[PDB]
Structure 1
């Protein structure tokens, strides 16, 4: 399948070169997979989600996304126009308040929630969780991410936006999950992207168009935006049967575009997420 005039990041993940604008992908499109977006919520009524999104849990007075960040990330996972995996099922877990903040205890509870809640959902092709969040190093936060991964969920986490080594941030620094840095449309490391040996992969993160609250759209930047590209890619590849939740991060690294990014610090992987789709 071909989506013309796609957001640059979608075109990038199906291309061996920057500078194109059509996204190519297998029409299975993540059907039968599920992606949890653990964030500020999801505006599931947005036409872009086509009834495939739903809120399943909140720790606050509403499950609605009063911020936009979670809706944007969910759109990059799975919206019809802005998403990588256009037929996946999206489940929102609101661990962040409408200012985008959340206590680590709530975030940990949300991860353990997903590890159990997947047993209440129909995801025959597999389960992914996208975590566009983080703070300073916490062994308890890392352990929660490790449990979620161990339970059979492909966990993708943001590296962070400090232009610093991600070893000092959580859940970015957890080795067993997929830690995602950000790149721009010219294949440069995004100016804010964290780096370091704990990163597994880069995805598009600068000037990413996606869904927003109020039935709208906007372009924003962050490792928060790169993470759902990888989460959606994992769901797509799992639906194709090419990999599993336990092996998808490694498979994405195996099959990535290699050595094509600029300003990658010595010791950080130079790997850009790529779907290897041959039309």
Structure 2
């Protein structure tokens, strides 16, 4: 399939070169593959989710996304226009209140929830978790992400937006999950993007246009925007049978675009998420 005038991020994951505007992808588009968006929630009623998104769990008075960040990241995973896997079940786990904040215990509970609640969902192609959140290092947050990964879910996490080395941030520093850095449309490491040896892949992270609350759209920047690209890519690749949850991050790193990003610090992988779809 070909989505013309797609967001540059979608066109980039399907491109060996920057500066193109068409997103190419197998029409399966993540059909049968679930992605948990562990964030501020998902405005499931957004027409861009076209019935495929629902809230499955909240730790606050409401499951309404009153922030927009979770709706934005869910839109990058699997919205019809701004999504990587345009046919994927999306599940909202509101571990962040509408200010975008959340106790680590709540975030840990949400990850353990996904590890169990995937057995309550129909994901024959496999399960992905998009964690567009991060704080200082926490071995309990890391181990919770490791549990989620070891349960049979891909865990894609944001490297962080501190322009620092992501070993000091959780769940970014958990080695078993997939730590995603951010790039811009000129194949530059996003100025905010965290780096370091723990990073596994880079996704489009600067000026990412996706869904927003109020049935709208908007463009924002963050590794927390590159993470749904990789999460949606994994769901896309798992539907195609290219890889599994335990192997998706490795597979994405093997099939990525190599050495195409600039301002990648020495020791950080120069890998850009690439669906390697040939129309």
The TM-score normalised by the length of structure 2 is: 1.00
The SS at the match of 1:62 is: coil
Partner Cα separation in structure 2 for residue 263 and residue 66 of structure 1: 35
Displacement of 1:259 in angstroms is: 0.3
Partner Cα separation in structure 1 for residue 23 and residue 138 of structure 2: 38
Displacement of 1:94 in angstroms is: 0.3
Displacement of 1:225 in angstroms is: 0.4
* Residues 141-167 of structure 1: per-residue CA shift (max 9 Å, x gap): 000000000000000000000000000
Partner Cα separation in structure 1 for residue 182 and residue 194 of structure 2: 8
* Residues 161-217 of structure 1: per-residue CA shift (max 9 Å, x gap): 000000000000000000000000000000000000000000000000000000000
Partner Cα separation in structure 2 for residue 143 and residue 246 of structure 1: 15
Unaligned 5+ segments in structure 1 are none
Number of matched pairs: 279
- RMSD between superposed Cα atoms in Å: 0.3
The SS at the match of 1:200 is: strand
The TM-score normalised by the length of structure 1 is: 1.00
Displacement of 1:254 in angstroms is: 0.3
* Residues 54-87 of structure 1: per-residue CA shift (max 9 Å, x gap): 0000000000000000000000000000000000
Displacement of 1:109 in angstroms is: 0.3
1:163 equivalenced with 2:163 (yes/no): yes
Partner Cα separation in structure 2 for residue 86 and residue 52 of structure 1: 9
Partner Cα separation in structure 2 for residue 30 and residue 101 of structure 1: 29
Spell out structure 1 runs of 4+ moving beyond 4 A.
none
Displacement of 1:271 in angstroms is: 0.3
Displacement of 1:261 in angstroms is: 0.3
1:244 equivalenced with 2:273 (yes/no): no
Unaligned 5+ segments in structure 2 are none
Partner Cα separation in structure 1 for residue 244 and residue 60 of structure 2: 33
Partner Cα separation in structure 2 for residue 31 and residue 236 of structure 1: 8
1:103 equivalenced with 2:99 (yes/no): no
